[PDB]
Design a protein around this ligand. Structure first.
Ligand SMILES: Cc1ccc(CNC(=O)[C@H](CCc2ccccc2)NC(=O)[C@H](Cc2nc(C(C)(C)C)no2)NC(=O)c2cc(C)on2)cc1
Ligand SMILES: [Mg+2]
Ligand SMILES: [Mg+2]
Lengths: 212, 233, 196, 198, 236, 222, 222, 204, 196
C-alpha cells in the first residue's frame, strides 16, 4: 500500500493505490483505499484491509451522529480523535492500521491528521503511509512547493503513487485522486498503472531504468 | 486445551439399500497399553439411531449421558414421544454437531470423532460425521481414525457413489464391514479382535450385535519368512 | 516388541513376537526378529530397526572372520562384540539386544545388552516394550534346568501375555531352539496362544 | 529515543524537547511539541512508547485543569508531580502500563522557587537541578555536572542548553531534528521559538 | 413471610382455597405401583379430545398430577425435572421417590418464607416405583407432604377420599395395578358429582413394576375404555 | 496443544454477468491426504435470491452460513419482509466476520446475486470481514491457479487488438451464461488436473430474476 | 533448616535448628522456627519462610475463633484440615512445608503437610534441607514406647545431625514438648553448641575516624 | 533488569547501649547511570524509623503508605506507633501483596518509648521478619554489609562509638558495590534525642 | 505406588503398598493408601497425593450428606461422585482412583477411574506405577468367586511382584476386607512376602 496526502496553496491532494495482498499473493488490484466520510471529510487506509475498512466505515457512523447531535459538521481534529481514541482502547490486541483523516472546515481550514494503531495522532502538511511510503516521499519531497498549481499538485500526487507502485512489490493497481477545497472534495478519477506508466514514461522521459 | 487419555479407535460405517451399518471394536487403549477390553462404543438412541464414537473415552461417556437425558427430555409433555415426535437421527446429530463446535470455540474440545448412523421416519438413510473441531460431512461410507485410511477404500469398492446404494444388499454390506474390521485388526496397533456391529434397517429396525470376533485370518505364510534380508535359516 | 531368551537343561531358546510399527500403524505383522550371527549364536533385537540390523550385520562379519582364523567363538565373544559396538557408539544408537548361544563346553548361555551398552549374564532375559508387563509372571514361573517342552511353554505363555497387553507386540510367536542336536525353528499362531 | 531535557536555573525552569517523530524508517514530522501545559506555572514534557505518550499527558492535563477550575486555585509543582508519580506507580502494576517518562517544570509562586521533577514510567520521582530521559542523559548529566552553576540567569541557562544540544548533535546516532525550548518563571510559560538557526 | 396471630400463614391459607377450587385429581397406591387420575372439565365442544394432557412425567419413573392453578403445577414439575436431572448426574441412579418428595417439599416451602414471593396454588399428587417399592405422595401449598395409600385433592376431594377409605378397609391384602386403574376411573366418576355443571374427560396414568417395568406410562385405548366402562357400570 | 483450526480444501468461483451471476464450487471435502466426501455441497441458496459459499475451514464455513441464513430470517421479521439487497447482505457479512476479529472464521467467503438495478453482483470477503464488489473471484485451495485465468478470460487483461501493435486494449464485454458456464467447467477441469484437493464434482448455482437454478458435473475422482 | 517431630508414649515433641538463610548467606543466627498454632498445637516450617509464618498465623487465628465458638480445646486434626485445604486451594504457590504436632482431648498427634496440600501421619518425621541427615538418626534410633527424656534426646540428636552435616542448618536447637498431662513446654535454645569464639582484636574506632559533611538534630514530636 | 537491582542502594541498622543507628546511601541510579545524589532511603513516623532498599518507586510508595497508616493509627489509638507494632504492620502489609510484591528490603529501627529497649528488624520482599538484635542489612551490597558488620560490630556500644562502627561498615561496603554510594546519612537514635549526620565519601 | 482391588465370593478386598517418594527419596515408608469414604466403601489412591486426598475428602463429605438424606449409597454412586470430580477438573488433576465397596444387594464391586475421569466396572483392577509389572501375572491368575484366603494370596503375590520391580513401590502390604461380616484390616511385612 501507498497512500499520501499533502496540503498546499489550493487545498489538499489525496492519492492512494489500489492493491491488496496476502503474503506474495496479489489478492486484488481494484480496492478502494479512500473512504468518503462526508462531502468535506476523507479517510485513507493502509495496513490490515479489514481493520481499516471496518473502523473507518464506523468512523463515518460516528461523524454522522455528531451532525445530528450538534447540528454542525464535525471538525477534522475531532473526527481523527474518535478514530485515535478507539484504536487506543485496542492497543496490544494486534490491530494494524495507518490512516490519514483529511478535510476542510471553516474553523480549521484544510487539515490532515495521521492516525495509526499504535495510537499516534499527528497534525501535519505532508504524509505518506504504507509499505510504499518511502518511494512516495522521495518523489513528493523533491518536487513539493507550497505554490503548486492545482493541476501540478494533482499530477505530483498521482506521480508519487506511480513511483511507489513501480518500486514497491506490495503497491500497484491504479491511482485514485482527490482534491479537497472549501467546497469539499472532488474526485479526480481512477488511473490504471498498466496504462499510466507508459504514458508518463513517454511524456516525461523518465523511468530510464526500464527496458523498452 | 487437554489431551486424550483413555482412547477408542476407529468407527466404520456404510449405507445399503434399506439402511445403515456401523461397527466399532471393544477396546479402550491407554497409549500403547491395551488396557480395557469390554468397552461399548456404539450407542443406540431409541431404535432408529446408533451413535458410534472414537477418541477419548471419558468424553465418550459424557456424550452418553447427554444422549440418555436427551431421550428423557424429549418424552417430557410429549404424548407423541414414541411416534411422530420421536427423536430423529438428524436431530441427534445436529445436537452433537452444535455441542462439538461450541466446545472447540471455547478452546475446550470433546476429544472425539463421531458417526451418527440411522434411518429417518420417511425412510431415508442417515449417515453423518462430526468431530472435535466441529467439522461435519456425509458420504455413502464414513470411518474415523485408521478406518479412514484403510476401511474407506475397501467400503468404497462396494459403494462408490449414491447410485450404488439401491444395488447394495445387507448381506453384501455386512460382509464388507466384517472384512474391513479384519484388515483393521491386521494393521492397526490400537485395535482389538472383539467388536460390536449394529444395523438399522427400515423394515427390521435396529439389530444390535455384541461380541463378534474377527475370524478366518491368514497367518500361515509367516512360517516361511526368515531374517530381514540375507538370512536363510 | 516382546523378546526373550531362556536357558534350559539341554540348551537355550529364543522367542519373539512379529510386529513392527511406525506409530499405531503396523508396518509388518510377520517380521522375523530372531537373528543368527553364527550357527549356534543368535540374538533378539529391540530399539531402532536400522541400528540393530546394522549392528547384527557387523557382528556376523566379525564372527565369520573370527571363525576363519580362530575357530568357533564362544557366546561370550559374540556378546563382547555386541557390547563393544553398542558402548562405543552409545550416542547414536538406540539398540537393545539379547544374545543367546550354545556351545559344548559352556552349554546354554544368555547375555543382555540394554541401552547403555552394559553386558549382563543371566539365566533368562526379557526385553522390548512388551516385556514390562511380564516381569512379574516371568520371575514367578521361571525355573532352572527345565525341559525343552516346559521352556517352549514358558516362552509361549509369557509372550502371549506380553502380546495381550502391549500394542507394539503381536502377530506370531517365533522361537529358535539351540542345542547339541542343532537348530530348530518354531512358530505359534494367534489361535493357539490367545486361548491360553 | 526522543530527547527530553530539563534545566533549573535560579529564577526559572527550562525544558528542551526533540522535534522529531520517527516510525520505522521514516521521520514523519520535524516540528513536534512533546509538551503539555498543566497550569499557567507548570509544564510537563514526555517521551516513550508511541500512543501512550500523548494519551497520558492529556489525561494528566485534564485532571489538573479540573482541579484548578474546582478550587479556583493552582496546585504547586510539588503537588502536581506527586499526582503524576502516583498515577504512574498505579499504572506500572496494571494490565497494560503507560510506558512514558516525564519531566515536570514549574514555578512555585508561594515559595518563589523554580522546580524540576524527573519521573520515569515506573513512578520513580526525584527533584534535580537538571534532568534528562533516555540515552541523551548519558551525555548531558556529565556535561552539566561541569558547566552548571546554581545561581545562573535564564539567559545563562539557555547557553548551557545550547552546549547540551550541540553535544547531542555531535554524538547521538539519530537525527532528532533540533529542540523546542520553553521557559517557566514567575510570569508563566513562554517559548523561545527561534532556537534552531540562531 | 407473615404469621397471623394464631401461628398460621394466612397467604398459604388462601392458596389452599385456590386448590379446593380446582378440578379433582387422585392417586392410588397398589401392591407394585401407583395409578394417577384426573377430571378434565370440557369447557367447550371445541376442545380436542385426549389433547390437553394434565398428567406429567418426571424423569422416566415419576408421575405428577395436581389441582389448582395449572401454571403453578407446571412450574413445579419443571423444577422437579431439574432436581431429578441434577440428582442423576451426581449419583448415577435415578432419584428415589422419598428423595424427590423432599426436593419439591423444600422448594414449595421456600415460597412461604419471603414477602416478595407468593406460595403455590396447587396440591400435587405424585409418585412412582424406585429401588425399594412403590410410593405415593401428596404435597400441599405449605410444602407439607406425606406418604399415602390413597390421595385426593380438588373440588370433589371429600367424596373421593371416602371412596379411597372404603378400598383401604376392604383390601388389607393390597390392590392390583390393573384393578386400581378401574377403581380410579370409578372414583373420578363419583367425584364428578361435586362439579357436574360441565361435561368431563377422564385421564389416567400408571407406574407398575410388572405392568410397565417400573416406568411411567399413560393409559390409552383398550385399557382406558375398560376403565370408563367399569365406571359407567357402577353409576347406572 | 489443541489446534482449533483445520483445512478441508475445496475451491469456489464467482462470476457476474450483465443480468445473472454464478457461484460454483467443487463437492470434494478433504483432510490432509484423505477424502472425507466426494459430495458435500458448500454453495447454498440463502433466500432473497442470494447464494453464498464460505470456503476454507468447513466448521467455520458452516457456522457462518448458518448465521447469515438466520440473519436473513430476522431481517424479514424486524423489517416487514423487505428483500435483503446484495450490498446489504455483504455489509452484514462484514459484521459477522469482524465480530470474530480476535478468533476468526478461517474462510474465504464469496456471495452472488443481483444488485438493485438487476445487474449480476459478486462480492468477496477475507477471513475477517474486508470486502469488495468484483466481476469475478476464485477462492480456496486452487484460487491461485484460477484467478489468473479469470483475469485473462473474463476481464481480457494483457489482451490487445491485433495490429494496433499494443496500443489499444481488447474492449471489455459482458459474457453470456453459456459462455460463463464453459469458463467455470474449464477452470475446474484445470484445477482438478493440478491441485490434489480439487476433484469429484462441480456444483454451479445460477441466479437470475427468475430465481436460483442448479447444475452438476462429474469431475475426476483421483 | 532441619525440623523433626517425635511421638513418645504420653505425647509428642518437636525440634528445629535456628539458622535462617538468604541463598548462601546466614541472615539470622538465632531465629525461632517453632511456631504456636494454639497453646498445645505447635508447628515447625521450612520452604518459603514468609509462607510458613503467614499460614501458621492465619490458621492459628481461625483456630482461636473456632475454639471460642465451640467452647472446646482446639484439635490438631482441625489445624491439619484447615492448613491442607488452604494450601491446596493455592496449588503449591504458598511454599509451606510443616510438621504439625500437638495434644488435644483425643490424645497426641503428629502430622506433616506439604505445600500442595498433602498430609501424612507418622511416629517420627523430618523436613527441610537437613531432612535426610535427621531421618538417618531417626531410622537408627527410634523405638516404640519412648519415654519423654528419650524422645527429647532423639529429637535433639536428629537436629544436630542437621546442624553439623547440612549447610542449610546450624546454630542452636529449639525444642517444644507437648505431653497429654500438662502444658506445652517451650525450650528455646535448648542447646547452644555453636558459640562464636572470642575475636582476636577489638575493632572499636578512635572517635573522629569518620569524616562528616554536616550535622543536624532531627525532630520527632509536634 | 531484576527489580531489586535497577536503582541500587543500601541500608544498615545497629543496636548499642540505650541507642540505635540507621544509615543509608544516597544514590539513585538507572543501571550504570547515576541519576540522583540526594535520594534518602530512611523515613520516620514518630520515634520509629524505616529504611527501604530496592525498586525506588516501591520505596516511595511504601513511605507514602506507612505514613498514611501510622497517621490513622495515631488518630485512633491516641499515641504513636511503637517499633515492635510497626514491624508487624510492615510484615502484614507486604504479605498482603504476596503474588505481586513490592521489590524492597525494609529495615526498622527505634527505641521503645515505654520499655526503653533498642529495637531493629528486617524483612524480605513479602514481609518475612528478620529478628536479629545485633544488626540488620539490606540492598545491593548486602553480602558486603554482612561481612563488614559481623567483623566490626560488638555489643553495648556508646552512641558516639556506634556512630563510628556503623559508618565504617556502610562506607566500606558501599565502595565494593557498583550500584551503591554517592553519599550517606547516619541517624543516631536515643530515647531523648536524634542526630543525623551526612557522611563524606568517595563520589565514584 | 502399587494398588489393587479384587471382587470375590464373600465381597471385595483392597490392597496397596506403603511407599511414597519424592524423586528417589522415600518420603514415607509406612503410608496408608487405603482410604475410607464410607463404612463399606473404600478407595485406593494413585497420582498426586494432594489431589487424591482433596478428592477423597470431598467424596467422604458428599457421601455423608447423601446418607443423612437418602440412606446408604451404592458403590456405583460413590464411583460416580469420584468421576464427576475427576472428569470436571481434569485439566488440573493427576488422580488415579480405584473404588471398591461391599453392598447387600450388589455384593462386592470394583470401579476404576484413571486419569481422564472415565469409569470402568471390573472384576478386579490394578493401578499405580508398579502395576505395569503385574498385568501378565494378574491376568493369568485371577479367577471369579475365589475364597477369602485365596484372594488374600492373589493380592499378596501380585503386590510383592510389583514391589520387587517398581522402585516407587515398597514397604508393607496393607489390605482391607469388605464383606457382610464387617471390615477387616490386614498387614503384611517384607519378611513375609519377599519369600514368596
Ligand atoms: C480496503 C483495503 C484493502 C487493502 C488494503 C491493503 N492491505 C492489504 O492488502 C493487507 C496486507 C497484509 C497485512 C498487513 C498488515 C496487517 C495485516 C495484513 N492484506 C490483507 O489484509 C489480506 C487481504 C486478503 N486476504 C485474502 C485471503 C483470503 C487470505 C487469500 N485475500 O485478500 N488479509 C489478510 O492478510 C488476513 C489474514 C487473516 C487471517 O485475516 N485477514 C488496505 C485497505
Ligand atoms: Mg498386542
Ligand atoms: Mg562510578
Amino acid at each position: 500500500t501507498t497512500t499520501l496526502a499533502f496540503r498546499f496553496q489550493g487545498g489538499i491532494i489525496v492519492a492512494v493505490d489500489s492493491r491488496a495482498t496476502a503474503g506474495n499473493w496479489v489478492a486484488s488490484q481494484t480496492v478502494k483505499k479512500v473512504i468518503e466520510i462526508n462531502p468535506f471529510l476523507l479517510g485513507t487506509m493502509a495496513g490490515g484491509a479489514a481493520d481499516c475498512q471496518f473502523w473507518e466505515t464506523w468512523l463515518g457512523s460516528q461523524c454522522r451522529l455528531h451532525e445530528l447531535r450538534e447540528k454542525e459538521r464535525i471538525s477534522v481534529a475531532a473526527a481523527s480523535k474518535i478514530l485515535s481514541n478507539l484504536v487506543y482502547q485496542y492497543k496490544g490486541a494486534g490491530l494494524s492500521m495507518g490512516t490519514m483523516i483529511c478535510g476542510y472546515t471553516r474553523k480549521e481550514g484544510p487539515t490532515i491528521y495521521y492516525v495509526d494503531s499504535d495510537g499516534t495522532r499527528l497534525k501535519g502538511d505532508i504524509f505518506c503511509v504504507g509499505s510504499g511510503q518511502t518511494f512516495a516521499y522521495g518523489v513528493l519531497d523533491s518536487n513539493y512547493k507550497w505554490d503548486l498549481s492545482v493541476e501540478d499538485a494533482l499530477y505530483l500526487g498521482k506521480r508519487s503513487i506511480l513511483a511507489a507502485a513501480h518500486r514497491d512489490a506490495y503497491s500497484g493497481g491504479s491511482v485514485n485522486l482527490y482534491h479537497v477545497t472549501e467546497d469539499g472534495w472532488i474526485y479526480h478519477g481512477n488511473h490504471d498503472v498498466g496504462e499510466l506508466f507508459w504514458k508518463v514514461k513517454e511524456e516525461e522521459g523518465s523511468f530510464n531504468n526500464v527496458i523498452g | 486445551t487437554q489431551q486424550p487419555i483413555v482412547t477408542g479407535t476407529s468407527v466404520i460405517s456404510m449405507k445399503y439399500d434399506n439402511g445403515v451399518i456401523i461397527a466399532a471394536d471393544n477396546l479402550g487403549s491407554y497409549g500403547s497399553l491395551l488396557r480395557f477390553n469390554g468397552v461399548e462404543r456404539l450407542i443406540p438412541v431409541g431404535d432408529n439411531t446408533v451413535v458410534g464414537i472414537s477418541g477419548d473415552i471419558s468424553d465418550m461417556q459424557h456424550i452418553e449421558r447427554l444422549l440418555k437425558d436427551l431421550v428423557t427430555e424429549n418424552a417430557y409433555d410429549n404424548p407423541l414421544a414414541d411416534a411422530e415426535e420421536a427423536l430423529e437421527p438428524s436431530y441427534i446429530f445436529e445436537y452433537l454437531a452444535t455441542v462439538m463446535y461450541q466446545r472447540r470455540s471455547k478452546m475446550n474440545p470433546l476429544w472425539n470423532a463421531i458417526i451418527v448412523a440411522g434411518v429417518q421416519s420417511n425412510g431415508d438413510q442417515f449417515l453423518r460425521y462430526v468431530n472435535l473441531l466441529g467439522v461435519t460431512y456425509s458420504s455413502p461410507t464414513l470411518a474415523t481414525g485408521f478406518g479412514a485410511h484403510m476401511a474407506n477404500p475397501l467400503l468404497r469398492k462396494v459403494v462408490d457413489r449414491e447410485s450404488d446404494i439401491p444395488k447394495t444388499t445387507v448381506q453384501v454390506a455386512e460382509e464388507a464391514i466384517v472384512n474391513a474390521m479384519r484388515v483393521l485388526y491386521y494393521r492397526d496397533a490400537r485395535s482389538s479382535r472383539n467388536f460390536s456391529l449394529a444395523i438399522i434397517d427400515k423394515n427390521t429396525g435396529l439389530t444390535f450385535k455384541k461380541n463378534l470376533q474377527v475370524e478366518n485370518m491368514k497367518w500361515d505364510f509367516a512360517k516361511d519368512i526368515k531374517g530381514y534380508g540375507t538370512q536363510k535359516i | 516388541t516382546s523378546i526373550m531368551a531362556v536357558t534350559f537343561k539341554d540348551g537355550v531358546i529364543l522367542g519373539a513376537d512379529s510386529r513392527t510399527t511406525t506409530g499405531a500403524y503396523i508396518a509388518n505383522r510377520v517380521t522375523d526378529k530372531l537373528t543368527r550371527v553364527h550357527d549356534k549364536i543368535w540374538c533378539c533385537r529391540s530399539g531402532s530397526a536400522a541400528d540393530t540390523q546394522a549392528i547384527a550385520d557387523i557382528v556376523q562379519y566379525h564372527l565369520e572372520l573370527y571363525t576363519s582364523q580362530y575357530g568357533t567363538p564362544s557366546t561370550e565373544t559374540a556378546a563382547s562384540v555386541f557390547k563393544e559396538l553398542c558402548y562405543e557408539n552409545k550416542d547414536n544408537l538406540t539398540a537393545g539386544i539379547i544374545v543367546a548361544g550354545y556351545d559344548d563346553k559352556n552349554k546354554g548361555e544368555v547375555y543382555t545388552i540394554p541401552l547403555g551398552g552394559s553386558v549382563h549374564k543371566l539365566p533368562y532375559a526379557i526385553a522390548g516394550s512388551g516385556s514390562t508387563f511380564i516381569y512379574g509372571y516371568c520371575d514367578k514361573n521361571f525355573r532352572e534346568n527345565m525341559s525343552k517342552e516346559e521352556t517352549v511353554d514358558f516362552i509361549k505363555h509369557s509372550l502371549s501375555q506380553a502380546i495381550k497387553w502391549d500394542g507394539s507386540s503381536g502377530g506370531v510367536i517365533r522361537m529358535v531352539v539351540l542345542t547339541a542336536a542343532g537348530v530348530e525353528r518354531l512358530i505359534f499362531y494367534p489361535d493357539e496362544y490367545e486361548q491360553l | 529515543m526522543d530527547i527530553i531535557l530539563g534545566i533549573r536555573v535560579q529564577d526559572s525552569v527550562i525544558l528542551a524537547s526533540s522535534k522529531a517523530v520517527t516510525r520505522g524508517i521514516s521521520v514523519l514530522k520535524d516540528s513536534d511539541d512533546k509538551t503539555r501545559q498543566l497550569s499557567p506555572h507548570t509544564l510537563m514534557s514526555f517521551a516513550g512508547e508511541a500512543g501512550d505518550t500523548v494519551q497520558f499527558a492529556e489525561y494528566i492535563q485534564a485532571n489538573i485543569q479540573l482541579y484548578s477550575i474546582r478550587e479556583d486555585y493552582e496546585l504547586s509543582p510539588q503537588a502536581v508531580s506527586s499526582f503524576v508519580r502516583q498515577e504512574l506507580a498505579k499504572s506500572i502494576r496494571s494490565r497494560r502500563p503507560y510506558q512514558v517518562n516525564v519531566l515536570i517544570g514549574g514555578y512555585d509562586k508561594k515559595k518563589n522557587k523554580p522546580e524540576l521533577y524527573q519521573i520515569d514510567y515506573l513512578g520513580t520521582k526525584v527533584e534535580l537541578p537538571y534532568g534528562a530521559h533516555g540515552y541523551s542523559g548519558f551525555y548531558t548529566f556529565s556535561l552539566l555536572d561541569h558547566h552548571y552553576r546554581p545561581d545562573m540567569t535564564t539567559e545563562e541557562g539557555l547557553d548551557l542548553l545550547k552546549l547540551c544540544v550541540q553535544e547531542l548533535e555531535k554524538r547521538m546516532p539519530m537525527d532528532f531534528k533540533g529542540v523546542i525550548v520553553k521557559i517557566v518563571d514567575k510570569d508563566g510559560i513562554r517559548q523561545v521559538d527561534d532556537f534552531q538557526a540562531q | 413471610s407473615v404469621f397471623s396471630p394464631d401461628g398460621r400463614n394466612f397467604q398459604v391459607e388462601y392458596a389452599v382455597k385456590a386448590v379446593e377450587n380446582g378440578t379433582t385429581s387422585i392417586g392410588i397406591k397398589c401392591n407394585d405401583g401407583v395409578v394417577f387420575a384426573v377430571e378434565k372439565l370440557i369447557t367447550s365442544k371445541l376442545l380436542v379430545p385426549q389433547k390437553n394432557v394434565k398428567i406429567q412425567v418426571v424423569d422416566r419413573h415419576i408421575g405428577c398430577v395436581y389441582s389448582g392453578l395449572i401454571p403453578d403445577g407446571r412450574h413445579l414439575v419443571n423444577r422437579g425435572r431439574e432436581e431429578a436431572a441434577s440428582f442423576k448426574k451426581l449419583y448415577k441412579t435415578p432419584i428415589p421417590i422419598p428423595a424427590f418428595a423432599d426436593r419439591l417439599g423444600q422448594y414449595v416451602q421456600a415460597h412461604t418464607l419471603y414477602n416478595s414471593v407468593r406460595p403455590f396454588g396447587v396440591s400435587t399428587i405424585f409418585g412412582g416405583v424406585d429401588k425399594n417399592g412403590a410410593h405415593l405422595y401428596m404435597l400441599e401449598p405449605s410444602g407439607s407432604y406425606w406418604g399415602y395409600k390413597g390421595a385426593a385433592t380438588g373440588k370433589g376431594r371429600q367424596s373421593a377420599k371416602a371412596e379411597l377409605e372404603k378400598l383401604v378397609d376392604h383390601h388389607p391384602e393390597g390392590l392390583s395395578a390393573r384393578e386400581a386403574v378401574k377403581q380410579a376411573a370409578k372414583i373420578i366418576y363419583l367425584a364428578h358429582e361435586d362439579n357436574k355443571e360441565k361435561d368431563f374427560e377422564l385421564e389416567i396414568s400408571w407406574c407398575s413394576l410388572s405392568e410397565t417395568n417400573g416406568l411411567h406410562k399413560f393409559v390409552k385405548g383398550d385399557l382406558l375404555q375398560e376403565a370408563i366402562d367399569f365406571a359407567q357400570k357402577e353409576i347406572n | 496443544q489443541f489446534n482449533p483450526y483445520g483445512d478441508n480444501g475445496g475451491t469456489i468461483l464467482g462470476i457476474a454477468g450483465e443480468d445473472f451471476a454464478v457461484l460454483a464450487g467443487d463437492t470434494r471435502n478433504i483432510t490432509d491426504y484423505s477424502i472425507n466426501s466426494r459430495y458435500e455441497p458448500k454453495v447454498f441458496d440463502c433466500g432473497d435470491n442470494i447464494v453464498m459459499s464460505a470456503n476454507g475451514f468447513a466448521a467455520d464455513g458452516d457456522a457462518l452460513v448458518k448465521r447469515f441464513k438466520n440473519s436473513v430470517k430476522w431481517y424479514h421479521f424486524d423489517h416487514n419482509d423487505k428483500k435483503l439487497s446484495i450490498n446489504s447482505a455483504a455489509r452484514n457479512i462484514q459484521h459477522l466476520l469482524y465480530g470474530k476479529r480476535f478468533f476468526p472464521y478461517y474462510v474465504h467467503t464469496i456471495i452472488a446475486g443481483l444488485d438493485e438495478d438487476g445487474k449480476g453482483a459478486v462480492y468477496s470477503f477475507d477471513p475477517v470481514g474486508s470486502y469488495e464488489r468484483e466481476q469475478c473471484r476464485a477462492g480456496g485451495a486452487a484460487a491461485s491457479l484460477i484467478m489468473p485465468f479469470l483475469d485473462n478470460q473474463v476481464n481480457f487483461k494483457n489482451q490487445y487488438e491485433p495490429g494496433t501493435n499494443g496500443k489499444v486494449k481488447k474492449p471489455l464485454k459482458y459474457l453470456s451464461v453459456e459462455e460463463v458456464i464453459k469458463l467455470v467447467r474449464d477452470s475446474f477441469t484445470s484445477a482438478t488436473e493440478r491441485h490434489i484437493q480439487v476433484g469429484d464434482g462441480l456444483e454451479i448455482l445460477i441466479v437470475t430474476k427468475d430465481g436460483v437454478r442448479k447444475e452438476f458435473y462429474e469431475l475426476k475422482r483421483d | 533448616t532441619t525440623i523433626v517431630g517425635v511421638k513418645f508414649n504420653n505425647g509428642v515433641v518437636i525440634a528445629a535448628d535456628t539458622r535462617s538463610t538468604q541463598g548462601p548467606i546466614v541472615a539470622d543466627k538465632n531465629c525461632a522456627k517453632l511456631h504456636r498454632i494454639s497453646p498445645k498445637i505447635w508447628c515447625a516450617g521450612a520452604g518459603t519462610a514468609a509462607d510458613t509464618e503467614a499460614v501458621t498465623q492465619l490458621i492459628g487465628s481461625n483456630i482461636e475463633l473456632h475454639s471460642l465458638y465451640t467452647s472446646r480445646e482446639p484439635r490438631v486434626v482441625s489445624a491439619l484440615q484447615m492448613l491442607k485445604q488452604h494450601l491446596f486451594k493455592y496449588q503449591g504457590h504458598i511454599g509451606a512445608y510443616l510438621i504439625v504436632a500437638g495434644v488435644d482431648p483425643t490424645g497426641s498427634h503428629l502430622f506433616s503437610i506439604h505445600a500442595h496440600g498433602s498430609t501424612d501421619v507418622g511416629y517420627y518425621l523430618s523436613l527441610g534441607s537437613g531432612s535426610l541427615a535427621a531421618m538417618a538418626v531417626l531410622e537408627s534410633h527410634w523405638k516404640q514406647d519412648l519415654t519423654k527424656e528419650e524422645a527429647i534426646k532423639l529429637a535433639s540428636d536428629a537436629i544436630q545431625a542437621g546442624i553439623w552435616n547440612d549447610l542449610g542448618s546450624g546454630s542452636n536447637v529449639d525444642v517444644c514438648v507437648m505431653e497429654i498431662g500438662k502444658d506445652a513446654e517451650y525450650l528455646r535454645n535448648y542447646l547452644t553448641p555453636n558459640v562464636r569464639e572470642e575475636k582476636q582484636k577489638s575493632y572499636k574506632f578512635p572517635r573522629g575516624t569518620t569524616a562528616v559533611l554536616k550535622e543536624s538534630i532531627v525532630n520527632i514530636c509536634d | 533488569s531484576d527489580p531489586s537491582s535497577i536503582n541500587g542502594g543500601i541500608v544498615v541498622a545497629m543496636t548499642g547501649k540505650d541507642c540505635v543507628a540507621i544509615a543509608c546511601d544516597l544514590r539513585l541510579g538507572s543501571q550504570s547511570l547515576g541519576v540522583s545524589n540526594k535520594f534518602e532511603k530512611i523515613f520516620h513516623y514518630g520515634h520509629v524509623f524505616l529504611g527501604i532498599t530496592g525498586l525506588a518507586t516501591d520505596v516511595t510508595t511504601l513511605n507514602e503508605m506507612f505514613r498514611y497508616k501510622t497517621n490513622l493509627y495515631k488518630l485512633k489509638e491516641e499515641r504513636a506507633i511503637e517499633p515492635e507494632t510497626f514491624t508487624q504492620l510492615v510484615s502484614s502489609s507486604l504479605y498482603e501483596r504476596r503474588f505481586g510484591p513490592y521489590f524492597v528490603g525494609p529495615v526498622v529501627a527505634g527505641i521503645n518509648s515505654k520499655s526503653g529497649k533498642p529495637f531493629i528488624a528486617g524483612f524480605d520482599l513479602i514481609g518475612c521478619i528478620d529478628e536479629a538484635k545485633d544488626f540488620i542489612v539490606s540492598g545491593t551490597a548486602s553480602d558486603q554489609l554482612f561481612g563488614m558488620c559481623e567483623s566490626l560490630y560488638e555489643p553495648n556500644l556508646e552512641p558516639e562509638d556506634l556512630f563510628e562502627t556503623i559508618s565504617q561498615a556502610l562506607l566500606n561496603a558501599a565502595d565494593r558495590d557498583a550500584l551503591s554510594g554517592w553519599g550517606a546519612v547516619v541517624y543516631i537514635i536515643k530515647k531523648d534525642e536524634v542526630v543525623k549526620r551526612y557522611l563524606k565519601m568517595r563520589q565514584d
